[PDB]
Ligand binder design. Sequence first.
Ligand SMILES: C[S@@+](CC[C@H](N)C(=O)[O-])C[C@H]1O[C@@H](n2cnc3c(N)ncnc32)[C@H](O)[C@@H]1O
Ligand SMILES: [Zn+2]
Ligand SMILES: [Zn+2]
Ligand SMILES: [Zn+2]
Ligand SMILES: [Zn+2]
Length: 488
Amino acid sequence: DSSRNKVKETLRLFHGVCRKILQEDEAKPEDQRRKGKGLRIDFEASTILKRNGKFLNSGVHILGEVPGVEVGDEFQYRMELNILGIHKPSQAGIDYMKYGKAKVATSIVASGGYDDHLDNSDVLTYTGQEDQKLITGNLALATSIEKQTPVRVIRGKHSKGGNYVYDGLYLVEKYWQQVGSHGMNVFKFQLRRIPGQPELSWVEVKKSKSKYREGLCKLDISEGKEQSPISAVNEIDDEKPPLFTYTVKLIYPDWCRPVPPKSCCCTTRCTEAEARVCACVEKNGGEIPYNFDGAIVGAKPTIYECGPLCKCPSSCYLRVTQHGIKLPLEIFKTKSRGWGVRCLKSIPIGSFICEYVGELLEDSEAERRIGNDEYLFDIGNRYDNSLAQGMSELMESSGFTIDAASKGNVGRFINHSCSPNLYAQNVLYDHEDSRIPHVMFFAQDNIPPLQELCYDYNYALDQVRDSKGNIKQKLCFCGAAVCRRRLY
Ligand SMILES: C[S@@+](CC[C@H](N)C(=O)[O-])C[C@H]1O[C@@H](n2cnc3c(N)ncnc32)[C@H](O)[C@@H]1O
Ligand SMILES: [Zn+2]
Ligand SMILES: [Zn+2]
Ligand SMILES: [Zn+2]
Ligand SMILES: [Zn+2]
């Protein structure tokens, strides 16, 4: 029930610790950094979580589906498999457990180039293990043929971007022996995916790359304004996306034209390591809030980026959300929540998605809203310090509203979930007005491709009111195992 949430939170804690350790290394002068000399942030984070009892399913083998782990789930590090107890061994490709007097495989890691042909997508050929011997793992995978017991398959790319993918449950059908190219016998196993499971994510991505893709009903809702086109897909009905004036960047009315923020004195990328003063690093409380790869280290009340009069180059480490969308986004028709947003590739945890763009207005003007309050985003105090607290145990609301009813960007189409994979992060760079930060969405999960993007709308129950002025209700259809059942 809450096992999905405990899995996601466990991973979130792991990656938070990883990015903290890495931040710590990136703050050091290049000469004293450990990244070169065998820094293993995954192993340190792993150790920290283990020594605090954070590992799930430890000391127990599971055959078949693991609670809270779903088909399509992606992992950046192999040790995540260890932390969740999906796949116990540190290095070995095959994991197994006792079954009667024998042993059957519970899990395999097919690391590498995988076959990408669509008419064989349910079938997998797996190499075993100078001759390979029918012992331990190989023997267990062979016994799986006799028992017809399910095997978990994890696809491993030969880093950071969707390195391990859980592809679901397979049955082992046969095995044989042949000379490998190293010159000795190896074992080969044929597995078949069990019918009834969600489609493989690589299959969906592959089908999505075609121009004859099912349901494709618009090439670019951006109308050529975003640097990459944002398409629209509808496999549900024949409805087309709502019309609105697409707006890439937030445009300030004259009542809040930016007063020029306090600038920067660095001729190159800002970092803690370079020792002369950077004002923008002090704005962030003496830290760089991003890792050097662009990922947010961890949610904060406010992040300060370098602005228009900082002498920094575009690739400064404090310049991230200001460069706009980089992911290949698209909107698509949901069954019961109107239009939603998703991405055509994996999104690494910590990645910036997009801004909530629209017309800025004061609250008072906000309470007089007529027409569409579906696209009203109230700024102020969405910061969630849960993760920061959890990690510490290991180691002012705003009146203003963004109205995207008439003018906005793709962010207006992002739906609500009670178990969200995104969060809202306040960012300042072209001004220092605390009342009206940019609302920047970041990933708080490693997001598999084509998984719907969602954040917490954070409405208070029984405070959303009628056209005539009284309490209104709306049900939440987010489908999460722990759904709070009402949107407002
Ligand atoms: C900012 S709009 C998001 C895009 C919208 N779905 C559309 O088609 O234009 C918010 C509206 O989407 C719908 N919505 C978003 N999340 C929902 C959820 N979890 N359950 C039910 N409706 C949802 C609600 O009607 C809500 O008023
Ligand atoms: Zn800078
Ligand atoms: Zn600087
Ligand atoms: Zn600066
Ligand atoms: Zn819900």
